[PDB]
Amino acid sequence: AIRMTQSPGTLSLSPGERATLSCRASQSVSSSYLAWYQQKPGQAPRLLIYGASSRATGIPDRFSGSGSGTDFTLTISRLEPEDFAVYYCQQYGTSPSWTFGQGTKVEIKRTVAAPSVFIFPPSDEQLKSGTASVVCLLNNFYPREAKVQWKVDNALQSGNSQESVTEQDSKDSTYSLSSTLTLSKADYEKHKVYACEVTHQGLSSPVTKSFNRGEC
Amino acid sequence: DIVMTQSPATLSLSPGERATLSCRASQSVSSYLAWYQQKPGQAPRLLIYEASNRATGIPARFSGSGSGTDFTLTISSLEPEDFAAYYCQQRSNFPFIFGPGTKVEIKRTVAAPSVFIFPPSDEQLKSGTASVVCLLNNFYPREAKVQWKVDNALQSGNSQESVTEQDSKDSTYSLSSTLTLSKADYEKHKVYACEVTHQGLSSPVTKSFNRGE
Amino acid sequence: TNLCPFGEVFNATRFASVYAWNRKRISNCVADYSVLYNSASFSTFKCYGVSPTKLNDLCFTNVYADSFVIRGDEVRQIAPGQTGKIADYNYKLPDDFTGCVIAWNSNNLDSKVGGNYNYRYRLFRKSNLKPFERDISTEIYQAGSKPCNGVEGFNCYFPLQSYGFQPTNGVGYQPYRVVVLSFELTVCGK
Amino acid sequence: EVQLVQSGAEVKKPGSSVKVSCKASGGTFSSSVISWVRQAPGQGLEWMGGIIPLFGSANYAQKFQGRVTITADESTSTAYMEMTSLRSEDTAVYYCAKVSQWALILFWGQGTLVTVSSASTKGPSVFPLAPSSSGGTAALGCLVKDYFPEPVTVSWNSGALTSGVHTFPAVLQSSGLYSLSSVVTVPSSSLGTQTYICNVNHKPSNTKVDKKVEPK
Amino acid sequence: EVQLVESGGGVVQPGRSLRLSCAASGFTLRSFGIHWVRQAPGKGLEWVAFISYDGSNQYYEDSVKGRFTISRDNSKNTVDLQMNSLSTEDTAVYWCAKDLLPLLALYYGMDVWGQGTTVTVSSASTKGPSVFPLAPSSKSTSGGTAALGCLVKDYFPEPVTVSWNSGALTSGVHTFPAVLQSSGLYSLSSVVTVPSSSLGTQTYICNVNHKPSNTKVDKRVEPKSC
Ligand SMILES: *[C@@H]1O[C@H](CO[C@@H]2O[C@@H](C)[C@@H](O)[C@@H](O)[C@@H]2O)[C@@H](O[C@@H]2O[C@H](CO)[C@@H](O[C@@H]3O[C@H](CO)[C@@H](O)[C@H](O)[C@@H]3O)[C@H](O)[C@H]2NC(C)=O)[C@H](O)[C@H]1NC(C)=O
């Protein structure tokens, strides 16, 4: 079958620059049957271009489609901070036989922003139910790469934490991360000091926010 | 055929005024209409083609507009050189009928004509013909009327008029009417008069003479 | 048995100039023509030798969908037995034409502030165009003794001129997208 | 004009089957190509198959040729996508897309979320992330823990507080239940005057929770 | 440079034939379709006929249909107009006008015209004019100014030219257009307005020149004596 391959896998640019997304087809495809989608996280795909070059309703004129045969291009003239997403190309037609690309992700380039680290002890109401969840918040940092390590009485934990990362903020181009450490109430009441140690490019030294179980 | 109609027949505007000439088509000629300018003793000059496109070399003040059956040539600022005849021509179907033409003349104030009468010369009377000439000098507007009265009997069928082109300095017209009688018929009468009526005269003026005085 | 790809014709992002009018040949498809006539998107919908409402029935071997762009004044020339710049030198329909002529205003699509000069049309021609003939030559006309040799000049004209599609033009000078359906006696109605 | 409406979210166990509808309005139903696209969480858009309601012959991608049946009903302008022998890998959002033969544009449905798991529907427990007594700004939030399935909606002060809010994407805990954190960063000098109340809504369980977050 | 040059006009008896020719230079006639447009004396323009660049198409006006014949010598770059059964309603000035754009360019307008030739359809013979004096009198009294002139009567064909004092007097001179009398002969009058105080010292003579008849008349106009 037809195979749609996009290039690059990840496009990393600052706001205002020009994004040139590609979509290579294994066969010659009619240019009247190529669409471009923009998918922001947690949202349904948004059709940008159809017929290789027609902009959908409401799409700004900084988005333009072009190409023919096997090479097609989605061009963003000047990147706005909102223009970040995963962009897909699609071959379709008057026959039930469509194929999508694997997607190109456009992330914002921005000056290095150190995180703001906040640690949250488990609530007394949650502790009543036999579970303790400690939450470590990394707020408005850049780039996305960041290291979070849970140290319980200076013991590196593992296998009992989970991380979530918000997607690039449309206004300040920063990411946010939350690491949730979940223990039993029995295991939580065995230890005293609970700390998460955050390493990031914007930090001169690794930052450690902590609390002792029982302190005010 | 398709009938071309222009209006007004004559446009009398001071220099610098906006001139709006009309051209109407009996049937739709699409945008295939052309405007021409003809100065006296000259061939016509293409001003506008394809309804609204200006020809090469034509000043920007000339502009055309319209589609189908109603068109318009507009001279934004009338210049002393523009006062000529302007014709429209359809080019949708053969025959390429021309309009009746509109004469753009230079407007001015009312000037009554100075009337003069001339009895026939003795040289012409020996030929057997008598020609009495009536002159209307430097008047405006062009509309003038000349009435020949021989012994108070109104004459018709033996006189002809002629009007000059509008003078390029005082913007006035001139008229010369010539009565033509045989010498024998000329000597049957005494009072020869031409009665001129014009806008600059409150009522018809009459210049007259008596044969042999 | 496939579907009629009329969407590639009407919904195309860009239309061809009238001197190089596009022609999409169709073969063995099926179309819900009852979706066409009642579309308020079309300002001109004239069918010759066949009625539009009864179109959801007939069949043929190939239907031809010709598309181009002319100004509003010239839409009346897309019709049998017509004359003009378009009918004589760009797109000529036969006298015994059997098909439909669809057109709609595209000022919101084909006009640009300052002028869109991408759409062109043939000015003069050696002879009137035969029906369904396409002349795309841009040969300079050696109108004078001196040879142009592609060099435009004094008696050396370029056979094509650009439309001046501006949004503030009159409706007679606004761009209109035209689609001419012609039939040839696979494709039936539904 | 044209509009595609899909059925609601489904929670199926492994081995069961699910059937998603797609009501089409606009009269272009019979003369159209109606497809079905699947997007697994974190993965891209995948074309499963399509059918022309005028012909009835459904065509499937190779990956979905065995487990997927795509049907359409002209008498009600509704397309269907049935899938049997559901596995946890089949957890995805399923869109129905429509291409009319008279246009090059594509019409999409809002999407149907099918979650395949043994986990029963459960409302979330909302625990406060109490602020502490980072340079003048204090962070506070709510921990929305142990719910099934997706999604939950979180609003602060009934939507009157939108600035500085970061609701993290939920993580799937090893228990089979989801959990996320919604935090807000405020000026520290406001904690004593402003009331901070998070509003969690889990429509799959019809659970609404308003949790007042106060300092420690 | 770019120009057309008509030829062949003149005087023709009614029912007799005449052919006009339109030579061009600065370009090539073959490249353009050519028109013929006539204008009767004191009337508007009238389109007569057309020929394509190759001669394959010829279109005439209804009023000259079947009596005129248009043709072009492509090999020699010429256009002709054969006019037969000429009536007095055919007396006019005939221009040939070149179409602006080449080949089949019928939807714009004619841009290059010739100087035009005159065709007079009259059976009259050449006759010199009779110059009579229009002497100043008590009638010629516009408050300090008097009017005097000449009468150029009974001549054919057009034109005549009238000067005053062999060109020394040009201000206030009015030479009226000629009129065609019911006899088939033209008549014309020229007048000049002069100060009344010079009628006794300044001689006034009109110089009438009718080149068709080799006629040169200098007529002294004196105030009539009682
Ligand atoms: C390509 O076609 C799309 C879709 O056209 C629509 O669907 C087809 C299957 C046919 O049924 C068409 O008749 C139908 O219009 C075009 O997008 C559509 O454009 C039209 C006109 O610009 C929009 O209609 C307007 O909508 C407004 C607000 O809703 C109304 O107030 C008006 O009365 C008018 O009807 C229509 O909303 C829009 N639809 C979508 C989904 O965008 C598209 O413009 C066209 N593109 C090209 C290059 O031809």
Numbering used by the authors:
A (entry chain B): 1 to 216
B (entry chain L): 1 to 213
C (entry chain E): 333 to 517, 523 to 527
D (entry chain A): 1 to 133, 137 to 219
E (entry chain H): 1 to 226
Paper text:
The HC makes the most contact with the RBD, with a footprint of 650 Å2 compared to 305 Å2 for the LC. Of the 27 residues within this footprint, 12 overlap with the footprint of ACE2. CDR-H3 makes extensive interactions with RBD residues 416-417, 420-421, 455-460, 473 and 489. CDR-H1 contacts residues 475-477 and 486-487. Although residues 405, 408, 417, 460, 476-477 and 505, which are mutated in some recent variants, have direct contacts with BA.4/5-2, BA.4/5-2 retains the ability to broadly neutralize all the variants containing mutations at these residues except those also containing F456L or L455F and F456L mutations. However, all four Fabs have close contact with residues 455 and 456 and the L455F and F456L double “FLip” mutations, present in some of the recent fastest spreading variants, knock out all of them.
26 mAb binds to the RBD and 2 to the NTD.
